[PDB]
Amino acid sequence: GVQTVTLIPGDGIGPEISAAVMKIFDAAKAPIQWEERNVTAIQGPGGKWMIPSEAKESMDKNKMGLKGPLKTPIAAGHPSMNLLLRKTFDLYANVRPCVSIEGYKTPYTDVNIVTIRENTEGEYSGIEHVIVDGVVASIKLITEGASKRIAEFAFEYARNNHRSNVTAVHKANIMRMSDGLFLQKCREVAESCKDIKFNEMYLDTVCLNMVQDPSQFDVLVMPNLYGDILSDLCAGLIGGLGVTPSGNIGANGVAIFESVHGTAPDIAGKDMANPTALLLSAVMMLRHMGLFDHAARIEAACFATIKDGKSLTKDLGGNAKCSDFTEEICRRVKD
Amino acid sequence: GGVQTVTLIPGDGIGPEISAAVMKIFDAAKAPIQWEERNVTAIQGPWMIPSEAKESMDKNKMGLKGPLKTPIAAGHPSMNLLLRKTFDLYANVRPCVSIEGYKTPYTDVNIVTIRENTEGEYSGIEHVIVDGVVASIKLITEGASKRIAEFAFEYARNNHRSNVTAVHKANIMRMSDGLFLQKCREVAESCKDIKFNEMYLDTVCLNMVQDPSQFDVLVMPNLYGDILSDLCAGLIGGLGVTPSGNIGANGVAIFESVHGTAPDIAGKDMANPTALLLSAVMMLRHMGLFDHAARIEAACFATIKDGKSLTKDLGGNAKCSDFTEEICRRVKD
Amino acid sequence: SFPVTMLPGDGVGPELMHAVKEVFKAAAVPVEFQEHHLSKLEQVLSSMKENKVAIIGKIASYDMRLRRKLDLFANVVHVKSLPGYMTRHNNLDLVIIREQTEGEYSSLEHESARGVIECLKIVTRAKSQRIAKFAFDYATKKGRGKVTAVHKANIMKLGDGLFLQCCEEVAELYPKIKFETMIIDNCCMQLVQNPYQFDVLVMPNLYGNIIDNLAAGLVGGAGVVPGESYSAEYAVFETGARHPFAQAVGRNIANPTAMLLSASNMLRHLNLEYHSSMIADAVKKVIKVGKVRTSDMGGYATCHDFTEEICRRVKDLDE
Amino acid sequence: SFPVTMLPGDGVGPELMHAVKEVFKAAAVPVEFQEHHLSKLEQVLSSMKENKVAIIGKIASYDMRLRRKLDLFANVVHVKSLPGYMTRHNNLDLVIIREQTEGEYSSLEHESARGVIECLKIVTRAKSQRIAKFAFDYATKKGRGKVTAVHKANIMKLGDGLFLQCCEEVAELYPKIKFETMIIDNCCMQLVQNPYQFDVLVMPNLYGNIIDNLAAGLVGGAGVVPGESYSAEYAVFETGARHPFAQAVGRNIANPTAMLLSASNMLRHLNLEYHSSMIADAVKKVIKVGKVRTSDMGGYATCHDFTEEICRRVKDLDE
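Predict the joint structure of the above. Result:
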């Protein structure tokens, strides 16, 4: 039947582009119902910030969320938005598929890379110690359960999206014990998935090769800090964060698909925002739900809308508005 | 019912004399014990303890260990560490009781220090952060702490002990020692037939020296037990008269003498078996042979209260054989 | 003249500083207490920057933060038998010297994994070389003969061996002082059998906590052992055994001996030798004649009574 | 002449070093290399004490053991397009300044539980200040106009926050140099998109490794990009991209452009400026004319073919 997805439009241009996805999704006859929610943290008992309950309950029920850019909170004790969500839903895999867009020129044209970043430990452990004045130790945390879990999803991802190879990216030569254990758990899963080709590379090698020739790469899986970086690198190869979809897969079947770009408060209200990023994230969501045929159409009908280039938005090297860009996609998703 | 073989590790120096003495006291008491000598002196493998000694401990679960030798190589690891990692020795146990023959400023001491033996400050993990700046890693885990507290309340029930004190420093190390206290509480509320309390290490040290009457069974993390046990030993006479057992997994248990190897009086007949013997008594109670244990124990104590035959270290001129054979006489009651 | 910072502290503190004031008043001591009812309050650094000395009671957490703002790195505890008070170890004279800014005391703890806690113990050359020079300078200034370094360097090879390494080097700069090392747990056992083998003892923070209270028990308890902490610039006078339940129960039952004694030690530091020895020996004689004793000493007198007696004999011209 | 210690190292190292000396012979470079045949260790430091300058291939870790004995704290990579060699970002000119002694690179790892590994990352005020002043000292000596500090201080608020703090402080003593700050993952995205927005970049160890090889990819890769590592006294010249498969080619395949350019930058440091520029110009011309290119630049030429072409064209400038 038709499934309900929790919609989190966010702030600034978020509403405008969430509206745009809702209309594009409607033209596709896509069996999708929206349930708006607001994730802005509130002060819970003792002042400990939290996601609102209706936000949590609705995600735990519908499982799928579509979430736009969020404002940066100003209170100092206030924890990171990404951190709150990650901990509230156990979002353990961050997924960034980067694909060269036919009509948007960059120095790279043959790019098709999916970076799967472990999203819960590594150097982002949140553990630091002031050892003595002027000397700080930041604890990087690697565990076998988390490294096994992330490697199992990369192979899950490659199987479900017909992906040829998976590369584990690491620095086991420098961090022998921690990155070695990550690379070890990758290897062990790699043997129970012999139908996906697997290999290892060093992070520094991957960055020098990434920029000489990105075609040589496919699905990549690495520890946290390395993914936070490589994913932005790879997004830099296809045109920035405005054309870059993002997924966060979590516990209990929960996945939240988001735009990684900012609120753009100066162009809010104006018909100037670009929805490509959030829309492409919505087709990430569709494929995640198994609505491959619907996703393929909305995807193929936005690539087309950019290829002919008649009406890009301000950022994409064009002069048109959010209405026209949206309307072209609606028209073409009907044939 | 049935004869048991106990691995015997006589060891070095006065080692083989005093373990030979225990052998014969056990004989005089007709105790159900056979012995199987072995050598735990570590060897350079591909350092490790020899496999015949490991297979013997694996089969016979009980060992009696005399005093070992301090290795000379700097790269040679702690002989206690090898024995601990081999059999997973997690509980170090020191029953200290005032010997009535052997006058001390402390006359009514009966304390059992159950020490966690696997983690704590003795985790073996340290880093040089920068030049002249070292960080030592103290580890406290949930499982290790529960396991040590579960032994302690078991030891208190089986050895008919009335109170158990968790000794900690959780006002300083609020997370690590805090977790240890947290699990001792959990076990305590499952064995509500034991009056359980908590005390700070520094309070216990201050009170121990002033009145040991007030203590009973003390369970505590590694370093605290390493220190608290030697402190209580001094209450009653020192390493020369204190038993000690290290309880391990797979039914394993090694009762040792903690005094030194005393090489200057090796060969001569001047060693004092009292310490290695009272550990052998511990081994029996651990094994279940309560009647052979109380007998041998009562023989040793009576031999000391008489004072007729005391070794050079308790204030006599008796030889070691004069001391043992008197004990052997008494235990044939 | 002479302004001195007073921090009464928590517990029975205020009643002991009351005793100090009454004995000082009895003795007509030229020392005016500028006191702060603590428990930012950088106020006390403001005051010590002028006064340079303090008398404090029981207080990372606040105590270790205060010591850090005053750089009170060296702690000195005097373990001396009082002639009237009889214990299992009499005619003992030890000095316990303890590093106070390092070790397990900066709350450097974290969770590696559910049920797995790490806690870092910090040892640095800088602070080990400093506490080591202080112990030997203490032995030289005070006529002591031996400095024993207490450690666990056979287990924590780095770190306690660092502390050991710095002691051994400093020991070569003081050829007239004898230098020994002993392993913490051995040392504790020796401290009960025969503490007489020791002169001056130097160690890092946690072993200092342990031996501070252990040695205090040898010669009387937490109510009679005084202590001090030093800086380069600052001298703070407290009690020796400051364990969590030191005198924490009671009211009008506390023993003022410990505080009074380091009060007199403080007067010695201000170069008020006349009042320092007057107060000191008043207290030592009230304890020896044995008329009034507080409950920790096998007596039945109140804190007020015991202090009323010290006062009575400070003022008694036929001493 | 001029003595310079040469650590050929492994892989193409001994071959790339054979190129430096065939080109130095052809240019009558007044330099005598003192060759330490294999990678006990302190003879290289005693040789470095007199010579003060080295040129090395590739070989804690072995090579980051060397960097501690010689205090090579500051690494510099010159990322500059070569006019003949077309990439996706031509006419680009950046310098990467990387701190090399702290961070993850000291193997401070352990196991706090079965399947739980901790790696410590170290950041100190000492070395952050030293690399920040180096970066501004670099920008003024060489006349660059901007220093961008790369960090991840929004997540690692200490540590990376302490690096940023120092950087911001030193930035104030250098008013005619512009100082921006950029988050590590955003900066990597900018390097592939608009690398022209940067000048000097200063960062800690791991980010350096990342940006070193990233930006070397912008301008033609590990075959052409020179690096150098300084201490306060010593200068050691190497290749810029130091990843494990940097030049994992067989005999007579590898591109000597990286080592030769860094060889010319050594000659400048030795104040042999005529020779430094003669060898630099030769390399750059040979590359621009296009007759002879190594495989990594497209052409079919061996390494001997390529460097003997350098030799011809540089004995000619010595007409």
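Chain A has one domain: 1-335.
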